[PDB]
Every structure is written in structure tokens, then in C-alpha cells.
Paper text:
In this study, we investigate for the first time the conformation of the protease thrombin and its zymogen precursor prethrombin-2 in the free form using 19F NMR. We labeled all nine Trp residues in thrombin and prethrombin-2 to interrogate the conformational properties of the protein in the absence of any added ligand and Na+. We labeled all Trp residues of thrombin and prethrombin-2 at the 5 position of the indole ring with 19F and solved the X-ray structures at 2.3 and 2.1 Å resolution, respectively. The nine Trp residues are distributed over the entire surface and function as effective reporters of the conformational state of the protein.
The structures show all Trp residues correctly labeled without significant perturbation of the overall architecture. Extra density detected at the 5 position of the indole ring in all cases supports uniform labeling of the reagents used for NMR studies. The 19F-labeled prethrombin-2 structure features a conformation of the active site similar to that of WT (RMSD = 0.33 Å). The presence of well-defined and separable peaks in thrombin as opposed to prethrombin-2 suggests that most of the Trp residues in the zymogen experience a similar chemical environment. However, this conclusion is not supported by the crystal structure where some Trp residues are exposed to solvent (Trp60d, Trp148, and Trp215) and others are more buried (Trp51). An alternative explanation is that Trp residues in prethrombin-2 exchange among multiple conformations leading to broad, overlapping linewidths. In the case of prethrombin-2, the W215F substitution affects both the large peak around −47.9 ppm and the peak at −49.8 ppm, almost 2 ppm apart. This suggests that Trp215 exists in alternative conformations that exchange very slowly. The presence of two peaks separated by a large chemical shift indicates that Trp215 features two distinct conformations that exchange very slowly or not at all in prethrombin-2. We conclude that prethrombin-2 is more dynamic than thrombin, with most of its Trp residues in slow exchange between alternative conformations and experiencing an environment that changes significantly during the conversion to thrombin.
Residue numbers in the entry: 1C, 1B, 1A, 1 to 14, 14A, 14B, 14C, 14D, ...
The structure:
């Protein structure tokens, strides 16, 4: 996709969002608070996966072209929970800011032609190769509020996905809503944003009893320096993104995966490693698109 990762309301208008410079500088401030309301059009690739009947937010997702949405396999297929969705059970909403309000003349509703799950998706032991693509029935029309994110190439993945560099989780707290012991505060009313440092692989592994695959990375602050930035502000199967200092473009480096780690805030967020699985993604796009 030629235009990917340049937002109409930012890169295309020479405007910057409130925290992108802190990402590009990999700066971690002394401040405690991180997880705030997003600016309109800050995340124009942001997608909601909704159940047809009754209407409910199942998951997050991301727009990668006019016909292609990316999410987590577990959003579509989780036999232990009796979760098994067809194209027909689902729609997506693209361009949203408000969690609850129907945003007439801004948001678009699409149906799915087809669902594709990584043939080596494993829900049994750990959530390995937790990735899926959804083909829209009809191409969606890009707008100020609807624009695709880039997927990384080999050099962008090596360059951006490194311990101590800073990436971005956007969503409507659907991960929190799914996994929260108690619903204390309610779900956010507007799109949330949080910037999270990528964690050393060995620190990730020691943090959990889940067998951490190389198909996964993790991000978040040490409990030691207590921060209010919460991954659970993210949506299950939603985007983890980074800005390239080389071409000024937003790349999706991760998918919000399994969110059992969410419950006690001494753990980190676990993300599917997009570039690791790009051969499958590109094969599906090349062979089952146009």
C-alpha cells in the first residue's frame, strides 16, 4: 500500500500528535500517567470487530488496505470458549472515535467476504501464531478518519522492534473489559492511547509461566517505577504501532494477543510479532485478494 502510515490529519497536514516525539526520541519521562484520550484521526487504521447479533464490541483490528483487516486468531477461533465465527456472524466499524455513539458521515460499517487464520495458530498450550485476516465484502473508501497502517519490511522490523524503543497501543479498553476481575471504572467513551517501552526478551520470559514464542514480544513499564500507562487500555487483536524516523510512516509491529497477564499490574502486555508471520500475511493478500 503506497500511502500507508501517513495520517490525513497529521503527516499530510504537517501536524504532529501530542506524544509522537517522545516515541521517536524513545524518551521515558519521570511522569506517572500515560493512558489518555486520543486526538481525532490519531489512529485512522483503528477497526472495531462487532458481533452482528446482538451488537457488541468483540475485538480490535487494524486496516492494512482497502480490502484487508488484521486481527488476532483468538478473536475469531477459540474452541475452549466455544468461539467459532463465520464471515456472516461479524461486521467491522472503521473511522470511529466515540466508543458508543454512531458517528454518521465519519465511521463506515463493512461486511466480511472471508476469514483466514494462520494454519499453525495454536490455542492449546499458548496462543502461538495468533494472527488472522478478514477480507471486506467491498473496498472501504479512505477519508480523513479512515487510512491504512504500513506493515513492516525486514529492515523496518530489525530497526524498530528493539528493547527500550517506544510503541503505541490504541483502543477502547476491550482487553480490560474482557479480563478485569471487577469492572471498577467503566469502559472509556473515546479512543484511548498509551505509549509503552518494548521489554527485553529474557525479562518477558521470567515475567510469566506461559511459554513465550519468538512469534511474540512484550511491552510495558516495570511495576518498580509505577506507571498509569495500561496495555489493557488496548483492544484484543488491536494494533501496536511505531513511527519510522526514516520515512515518517506508522508501522504495525504487533497485535494485542492473549490478555491473561492483564489482571495483576506486575506483568507486561504480550503482542504477536507481525513481521515474523509476514510470509503468511503477504501470501493471503497476494493470492486471495484482487
Amino acid at each position: 500500500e503506497a500511502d500507508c502510515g501517513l495520517r490525513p490529519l497529521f503527516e499530510k497536514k504537517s501536524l504532529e500528535d501530542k506524544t509522537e516525539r517522545e516515541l521517536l526520541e524513545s524518551y521515558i519521562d519521570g511522569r506517572i500517567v500515560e493512558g489518555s484520550d486520543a486526538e481525532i484521526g490519531m489512529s485512522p487504521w483503528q477497526v472495531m470487530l462487532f458481533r452482528k447479533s446482538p451488537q457488541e464490541l468483540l475485538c480490535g483490528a487494524s486496516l492494512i488496505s482497502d480490502r484487508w483487516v488484521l486481527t488476532a486468531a483468538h478473536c475469531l477461533l477459540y474452541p475452549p470458549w466455544d468461539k467459532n465465527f463465520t464471515e456472516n456472524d461479524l461486521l467491522v466499524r472503521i473511522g470511529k472515535h466515540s466508543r458508543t455513539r454512531y458517528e454518521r458521515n465519519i465511521e463506515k460499517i463493512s461486511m466480511l467476504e472471508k476469514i483466514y487464520i494462520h494454519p499453525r495458530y495454536n490455542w492449546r498450550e499458548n496462543l502461538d501464531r495468533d494472527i488472522a485476516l478478514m477480507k471486506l465484502k467491498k473496498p472501504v473508501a479512505f477519508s480523513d478518519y479512515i487510512h491504512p497502517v504500513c506493515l513492516p519490511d525486514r529492515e523496518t522490523a530489525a530497526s524498530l522492534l528493539q528493547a527500550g524503543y517506544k510503541g503505541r497501543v490504541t483502543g477502547w479498553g476491550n482487553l480490560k473489559e474482557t479480563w478485569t476481575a471487577n469492572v471498577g471504572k467503566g469502559q472509556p467513551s473515546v479512543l484511548q492511547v498509551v505509549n509503552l517501552p518494548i521489554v527485553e526478551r529474557p525479562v518477558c520470559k521470567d515475567s510469566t509461566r506461559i511459554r513465550i514464542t519468538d512469534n511474540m514480544f512484550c511491552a510495558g513499564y516495570k511495576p518498580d517505577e509505577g506507571k498509569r500507562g495500561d496495555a489493557c487500555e488496548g483492544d484484543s487483536g488491536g494494533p501496536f504501532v511505531m513511527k519510522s524516523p526514516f520515512n515518517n510512516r506508522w508501522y504495525q509491529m504487533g497485535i494485542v494477543s492473549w490478555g491473561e497477564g492483564c489482571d495483576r499490574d506486575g506483568k507486561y502486555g504480550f503482542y504477536t510479532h507481525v513481521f515474523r508471520l509476514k510470509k503468511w500475511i503477504q501470501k493471503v493478500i497476494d493470492q486471495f485478494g484482487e
